[PDB]
Ligand SMILES: CC(=O)N[C@@H]1[C@@H](O[C@@H]2O[C@H](CO)[C@H](O)[C@H](O)[C@H]2O)[C@@H](O)[C@@H](CO)O[C@H]1O
């Protein structure tokens with residue numbers, strides 16, 4: 001479950017054998033983000049430090065920081081793949097609110113950009129297989145916009 | 153004053169016309185950190201996002217993130233200059249506790265590395281002039297190890 005700041009796998013609701021993965025797991029900035037197979041031991045490029053930067057409660061604003069690279073999960077354009085560029089911690093495109101979206105008692109959450117037009121973290125075309133683009137897309141709390149936070 | 157997460161100038165107690173500055177203010181990783189003249193408007197390389205990553209209270213652990221570059225304030229060696237390298241948010245050398253050290257009613261704090269041997273954020277040789285090396289040095293809560301957090 002999501003219990004605030006900590007290190008997590010971020011796991012798509014429709015495909016819980018997958019997690020949120022900084023593609024290629026390199027140290028250079030600007031990686032795109034996709035779903036990928038979790039594996040028995042998740043790799044550091046697929047772990048994320050949720051770090052509080054403003055507020056408290058459901059309105060709290062967080063950076064979602066890649067464990068391997070230290071770069072921040074960022075939305076760059078509506079209905080477009082998200083990435084981990086080098087970017088200021090005060091840039092709202094790199095800040096996210098995490099909101100309960102419990103579904104049949106599954107403790108899942110939406111991940112909502114501080115720039116409201118950039119919307120929610122979204123698995124492209126509702127894919128249930130490894131390697132799907134993760135988008136910032138218009139917020140609807142569809143099933144492909146829901147996520148588990150598995151504490152690590 | 154320090155009131156938790158937010159963007160701050162971090163100001164040395166002995167020289168309050170100065171602040172903590174990522175030297176050269178470039179985007180490449182690995183800048184060393186020094187005191188430098190604040191100016192009328194502080195520059196982004198001399199502003200820091202304090203971001204909560206674990207715990208609560210005086211024991212809370214924070215990243216101290218450069219506003220300009222997004223790299224984390226890090227201690228690398230005892231009694232050595234501190235820097236902002238590319239580094240994982242889970243590395244304890246990049247995590248700090250901020251502890252009250254009120255002095256004659258001045259609201260100042262110590263900045264203490266999570267790796268206890270790396271010690272406290274320290275103005276080399278108690279300098280009161282711009283351009284002094286900021287070290288990670290043995291923790292004594294000396295006056296050159298005390299800091300204001302001016303909210304920005
Ligand atoms: C094991 C390893 O490091 N492989 C490198 C590749 O990294 C993987 O990339 C996939 C996506 O193709 C995925 O992100 C996975 O989590 C990564 O471990 C990749 O960097 C490759 C170059 O394209 O080099 C491999 O050595």
Ligand SMILES: CC(=O)N[C@@H]1[C@@H](O[C@@H]2O[C@H](CO)[C@H](O)[C@H](O)[C@H]2O)[C@@H](O)[C@@H](CO)O[C@H]1O
Nearest residue numbers: 173174175176177178186188189195197198
């Ligand atoms: C105004 C500006 O950007 N100047 C550049 C220098 O940056 C300053 O560097 C000093 C330390 O010498 C200090 O960190 C200050 O805050 C910075 O603005 C520096 O990058 C210089 C190359 O060494 O280029 C200047 O253009």
